[PDB]
């Protein structure tokens, strides 16, 4: 085990799991958080789509490394980098990587609330009921300190303010005063 393992200069924010990605439940609630940060830290952020399955470090080894070293180039100018990754749903899904994401834990506090949100998205989401509550139960069993930001607030103003100060404070630790 070497002591030093090459991370980017600015860790990319990972928005994980109200439920499984690939559905109307998960992504649209995450689409609130790419909407918030796009103009809250506007001028100090780089928000990008991650199409390649970066958990493999299926997508080939040249495609993933190209997306790996892109994020190495995105965090080069001391700017906040955000990732719109669709394959990523778990902390251990990216434990082995040298990216070290600021894993942001969107939590619905009760599973009864979530299954009411699945019925409201339509019957085309009702065909996927128990598969969605499965991985959110996994993340409810996941340890809290293995994440970085744990969000359980219902108002967008509440969880995003909790989001805003934690991304401003990390901007201060990455930018010491003169």
């Amino acid at each position: 085990v070497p002591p030093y393992d090459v991370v980017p200069s600015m860790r990319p924010i990972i928005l994980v799991g109200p439920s499984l990605k690939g559905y109307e439940v998960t992504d649209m609630m995450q689409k609130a958080l790419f909407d918030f940060l796009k103009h809250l830290f506007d001028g100090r952020i780089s928000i990008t789509r991650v199409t390649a399955d970066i958990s493999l470090a299926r997508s080939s080894l040249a495609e993933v490394q190209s997306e790996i070293e892109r994020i190495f180039e995105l965090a080069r100018t001391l700017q906040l980098v955000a990732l719109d990754a669709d394959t990523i749903n778990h902390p251990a899904q990216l434990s082995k990587t040298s990216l070290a994401p600021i894993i942001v834990y969107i939590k619905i506090t009760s599973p009864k609330v979530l299954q009411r949100l699945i019925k409201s998205r339509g019957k085309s989401q009702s065909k996927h009921l128990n598969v969605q509550i499965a991985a959110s139960e996994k993340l409810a069993q996941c340890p809290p300190e293995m994440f970085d930001i744990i969000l359980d607030e219902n108002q967008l103003e509440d969880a995003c303010e909790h989001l805003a100060e934690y991304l401003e404070a990390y901007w201060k630790a990455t930018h010491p005063p003169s």
Partner: protein, 100 residues
């Protein structure tokens, strides 16, 4: 005593002048610590005391490489300042010197 204190007191101020202009030099890369460190008297820092000490899983904004025994960077933390980061071959040599 007298003959040794002329080179062994300017080598600190040559490294502190290496330390004082390094605070504006850009961040080269950053690493993830897999061990911890505390600076000792026998660690032989060119500037005694100004080096940093970290715990496990920390992040070091490596500004630059001081010599083959030390780097220059800072722990990524509010209020913390630039210090001396040991290179891994020096962290290996600080393990061998304890056994012998």
């Amino acid at each position: 005593q007298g003959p040794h204190m002329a080179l062994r007191k300017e080598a600190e101020r040559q490294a502190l002048a290496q330390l004082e202009k390094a605070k504006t030099k850009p961040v080269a890369f950053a690493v993830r610590t897999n061990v911890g460190y505390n600076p000792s008297p026998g660690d032989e820092v060119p500037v005694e005391g100004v080096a940093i000490t970290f715990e496990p899983k920390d992040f070091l904004h490596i500004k630059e490489k001081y010599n083959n025994d030390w780097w220059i960077g800072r722990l990524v933390k509010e209020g913390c300042e630039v210090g001396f980061i040991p290179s891994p071959v020096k962290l290996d040599s600080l393990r061998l010197l304890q056994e012998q």
